[PDB]
Design an enzyme around this catalytic site. Structure first.
Site, short mmCIF file in Angstrom:
data_model
loop_
_atom_site.label_atom_id
_atom_site.label_comp_id
_atom_site.label_asym_id
_atom_site.label_seq_id
_atom_site.Cartn_x
_atom_site.Cartn_y
_atom_site.Cartn_z
N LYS A 1 -4.69 1.21 -11.49
CA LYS A 1 -3.84 0.27 -12.23
C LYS A 1 -3.96 0.49 -13.72
CE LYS A 1 -3.71 -3.46 -8.80
NZ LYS A 1 -4.42 -4.69 -8.33
N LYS B 1 -10.16 -3.04 7.00
CA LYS B 1 -8.72 -2.85 7.11
C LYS B 1 -8.20 -3.30 8.47
CE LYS B 1 -7.42 -1.56 3.13
NZ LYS B 1 -6.34 -0.53 3.16
N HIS C 1 -2.65 6.08 -8.65
CA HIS C 1 -2.97 4.89 -7.86
C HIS C 1 -4.02 3.98 -8.49
CE1 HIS C 1 -0.25 5.86 -4.72
NE2 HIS C 1 -0.88 6.96 -4.36
N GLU D 1 2.54 6.72 11.12
CA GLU D 1 2.82 5.49 10.38
C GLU D 1 4.18 5.64 9.71
OE1 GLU D 1 -1.90 5.14 8.87
OE2 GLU D 1 -0.24 4.49 7.58
#
Lengths: 459, 453
Positions: free
Chosen positions: B234, B119, B232, B197
């Site tokens: 799909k 990340k 979360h 954040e």
């Protein structure tokens, strides 16, 4: 209701492989058959399960084993049989036996297979439907004045055929009237000497035609559509070599008249499923000559310019779906379109340097090109394969699409070239000669092309 | 030039059958590997060859045996390996061994895997490329007034997280200034040093398909919309996104190209964004192919797996073989939706059902792709893998049509002998909110009816 859970393909090689894909795609299980001869054939393995047919029979016969095939279908929960092309695909006995055993037959009805297996019944079918046919006497002419007046009615060139010559022998072409008297007297005495009867027929010679064919689909609800035409003019000794779609230099107004001709005839007989109508063309006129009551090897290139999967449609039409139903999904005529060009040829083990006699044996090294707009329908063209003398000796069928005909032609040539074969001969150098020739590349050519251009046979 | 004559697929199930198709359509010979457990797996019989891998290992580890996969490939003259998705498809050590044994790895370079499998490294490549990311303190905040000021610059809502904690176990939302005082105060006591954040709330989830070659060429194939998620995960992907502005679409795709060009990315890869109004934000690159890749092929008419194989064989994006037009000439037509039918019983907490499928029939037809996993009559579904029956993708000229086809095809599945999630899949695809074309990542989790049966 949809009934078809599992399908058996009664055939072999590329066209069996072709229908296996169509099935898997639609969620349908598959069954292949093979002869002892094909225990090493590629197609045996591309089906969900395979069974040996026609044991003890001969190589070709084992695929004609109507009762053993059907014994296999019933034995393994088969709902429908696809006959591909060129074995039992046009056989009336097969279709009705399927019908009795309650197995669906992907293809038209028997009265369709019958009416189009007889040249007389078809000729009548076409005239009934209002489509032009090639002028000929129905029986043997009575005498000279008949041939004269036939010629005054239809124009030379004409052609006089012995009755018992069957097709292909005891034929005489006449181009002028100053030529007919002797040519007739002679055609009698020669047919009498070679066959034993002096009887002769006459026909209108339609010389150097373009060979134009139209793809058709009918459902059980009477809907018909054409998928436009395929051009099959590139021929060697009357056998197809390269088909193009659409036809490059065919008038678009002529394109229209032809295609409608084809639907009008199939509707007049309620053709169900996939079938093709063949015409000969000269200038502005076209003449019906044959219907093929089945799919054809060169169906691929129509699928490419239209975007319609033809074999998937066959199956869906066979399970009761209509052309414009949700699942078939074929649009109304006015919305079906062609995009670009597509070409096909068939790489074989025919050695052009040996009168095209099919080579046999084991392929030591095998590699191909491939890519976008390129379609590789393999027969038994793979590394380590054993090619026998028994069948169609077909390595792979090659179909190439591109936006412009010129582009489609470069694509074909380049991919014929990319092939690397070691261990057996092939017909690639001749295919290379044909599609690289200015005449073909010109887009403008007829059925005299190959037979008339000798440089095509230099290697 | 080209060197690929044989490819081994280091995977199983639908994704391995999907690559087996592409390969054959290119004249390419195919090899499959199966674990003991997958001895009756469908994919094993769909390749030209097939060899048991990792015998004597757990089921998952079986498909993680790099050295056992290399062995099979060398013994059988394999030129290239397709990793598919979700096993060794992002494993740098797997790609490393391939290069080691001169085996082509159908996928990007090892540095692509490294930078995009982290990340931090990922965020720095995105930033260094002029691509927007989500705002955060580049380290722990010094006190309360910094959080205040962070939120004054980037705007509420904000998020406070612990360092020794991690995403989730140590996280708290703050929506107004009234809470920060107490919230910041709590986060310090609870976590017992914090980070802040910006929260991108109810974002749409848009991902862009990218392709690149060894010549430095880059094209996008536009976006897939993956907003429809349950926890979360799909659930239903659509392409292109139905209610996403063209300006914004164009802006989002170029961002993906700009970023992949700046790293010289090669082969197939996806750049994920979160969109909020007119803004968007980079979050992830999936340096491999995705399940949903079907629906993008369908709208553009470009075969991604085949392009994968040809690109790894040296072929240029725009070469004759790969055949992809100029970025400006690439078009999208119609709409495409994907669904995955599993044995997840939504009446038993979505626990995967196992057993023998006694009866199985599906629909099918024009505009319908069926990527079978192990959904077939007489199959035996084990608890070890993805438990997938069939990946279902539908295309149509309009979204409404494509939604109806997906709904219509779901309803035609007859499966007896085991449970599936079709009940959930149907509820989801029939709901008007989804049919409206205008939804985000909050759709499933804020619509309870979807779970009544």
């Amino acid at each position: 209701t949809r009934r078809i859970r599992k399908v058996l393909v009664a055939n072999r090689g590329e066209i069996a492989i072709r229908v296996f894909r169509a099935c898997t795609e639609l969620g349908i299980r598959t069954v292949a058959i093979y002869s002892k001869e094909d225990v090493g054939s590629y197609h045996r393995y591309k089906a969900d399960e395979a069974y040996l047919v026609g044991e003890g029979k001969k190589p070709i016969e084992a695929y004609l084993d109507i009762e053993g095939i059907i014994e296999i279908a019933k034995a393994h929960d088969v709902d429908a049989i696809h006959p591909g092309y060129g074995f039992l695909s046009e056989n009336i006995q097969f279709a009705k036996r399927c019908r009795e055993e309650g197995i669906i037959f992907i293809g038209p009805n028997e009265n369709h297979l019958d009416m189009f297996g007889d040249k007389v019944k078809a000729r009548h079918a076409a005239v009934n439907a209002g489509i032009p046919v090639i002028p000929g006497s129905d029986g043997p002419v009575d005498g000279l004045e008949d041939v004269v007046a036939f010629a005054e009615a239809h124009g030379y060139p004409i052609i006089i055929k012995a009755a018992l010559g069957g097709g292909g022998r005891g034929m005489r072409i006449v181009r002028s009237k100053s030529e007919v008297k002797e040519a007739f007297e002679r055609a009698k005495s020669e047919a009498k000497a070679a066959f034993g009867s002096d009887e002769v027929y006459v026909e209108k010679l339609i010389e150097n035609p373009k060979h134009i064919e139209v793809q058709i689909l009918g459902d059980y609800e009477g809907n018909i559509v054409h998928l436009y035409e395929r051009d099959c003019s590139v021929q060697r000794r009357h056998q197809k070599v390269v088909e193009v779609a659409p036809s490059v230099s065919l008038s678009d107004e002529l394109r229209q008249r032809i295609c409608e001709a084809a639907v009008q005839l199939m509707r007049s007989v309620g053709y169900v499923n996939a079938g093709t109508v063949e015409f000969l063309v000269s200038g502005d006129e076209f003449y019906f000559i044959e219907v093929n009551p089945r799919i054809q090897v060169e169906h691929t290139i129509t699928e490419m310019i239209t975007g319609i999967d033809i074999v998937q449609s066959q199956i869906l039409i066979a399970d009761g779906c209509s052309l414009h139903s949700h699942e078939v999904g074929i649009p109304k005529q006015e919305d079906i379109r062609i995009n670009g060009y597509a070409i096909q040829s068939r790489v074989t083990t025919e050695d052009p340097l040996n009168n095209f006699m099919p080579d046999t044996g084991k392929i030591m090294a095998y590699r191909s090109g491939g890519g976008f707009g390129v379609r590789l329908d393999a027969g038994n063209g793979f590394q380590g394969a054993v090619i026998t003398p028994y069948y169609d000796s077909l390595l792979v069928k090659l179909s190439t699409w591109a936006l412009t005909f010129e582009q489609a032609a470069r694509k074909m040539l380049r991919n014929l070239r990319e092939f690397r074969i070691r261990g057996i001969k092939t017909n690639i150098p001749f295919l290379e000669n044909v599609v690289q020739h200015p005449k073909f590349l010109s887009g403008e050519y007829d059925t005299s092309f190959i037979d008339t251009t000798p440089e095509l046979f230099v290697f």
